[PDB]
Amino acid sequence: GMIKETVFKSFDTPSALEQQLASKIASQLQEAVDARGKASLVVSGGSTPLKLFQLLSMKSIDWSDVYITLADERWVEADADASNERLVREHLLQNRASNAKFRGLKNMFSTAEAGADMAAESLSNFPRPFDVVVLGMGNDGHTCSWFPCSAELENALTTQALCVATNPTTAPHGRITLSKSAILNSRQIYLHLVGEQKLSVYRQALESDDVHAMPIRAVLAQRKTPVDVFWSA
Template identity: 50%
Template sequence: MPLHWVHEHHFPDSPTLVHALSGEIKVDLEEAIGERGACSLVVSGGRTPRALFEQLRTEALDWTKVWIALADERWVETTSPDSNEYLVRETLLQDLAAAAHFIGLKNPAPKPEAGAEWASRALTRVPRPFDVVVLGMGEDGHTASLFPGSLALARGLDPAAVPGCIAVNALTAPHARLSLNLSALLDSRRIILYIEGEAKRHVYLRARVPGTVAEYPVRAILHQRTVPVDVFWAP
């Protein structure tokens, strides 16, 4: 069954995708600044977006009016290479983009369960709805840190929940984590699902088919009809 609110964009290779996606994000943020005086961008970590961040930081924007936040974070020190904040600071918040405002999720709380409320409060500083949310997807169908099999998954995907962060202890992934819940991710004007490789393409195609969100949590993004979704894929 076609998902008419999901638009797919296929590219021959990663550099072509990165160039096109960076340009689209720039246009969205530029328009938001022109209309509302500020804009917001939520990004994910992992290996895939590194090249995108390095390209995006060169875009000519009024970065002083850009707010950047994370879709999820590992509960590690922000100086750790495993930290999403570390990735963003090293690859995105450089050059022109160093002037942007950044709100991280890791905080002084002793555990992510205690840190979730702190992070949710910190995110209230970021203009809402988010103008652009860039999500990735794992080969198990997770997005942000909403993992299949996680005890926190039902709470994270509850469409009636107050938008905010939840603590996640995923049996299939290293480190305890914080993640935006589905309500927070959908408090946005546009969602971009950025994936690369044939393996993830096959997972995405399975997630497009109606089924339980517990099997493939990314289904909650693909099958909602509140926010337009653009899927960017390259081999």
């Protein structure tokens, strides 16, 4: 049925959202470094997080003890327009966060299917559970590269591998994605949304726990891992 338990934080402006979200993430990463010696952060791509990344890059925490990776990646060169790694390197891995330990998902294999196993092994060393995961949501209800238009959705939702390939039919590029099992083996998830359309889609997502229609529900419907939704018009 519908999803009834939520934690929802709204803000005047995207800048107010970012300022707060950057502070919460930085605090949680530093508390993880304090507790365990190394922390792990998963971030998502797109235009939504770019200012957040800029703000995070200036936070004075032990960045060199933070391991960072991507929720998903387009199977394109890491300097291409469509690369999430390119956006992360330009905007996050700057300033104080220059010092962090980033690993992307793209590798030399010609397809995500062929590269997935190498990608999964390259992360086997990240601190898990992940300390902080930052997600987005598409207007179709997708998150990561868990797309309702892809044949590989059930695999993404049920595999124990850390990452798998997916091939959306309603969005461009072969994809690699972290799996549900990987994303939910985390301490804190943030869902970062902007604008009235995304708010409408989020409300639609709460109408049910049918993950195959809107895969963001796999994150919203569960009760073990805290999820805080940050939104501004």
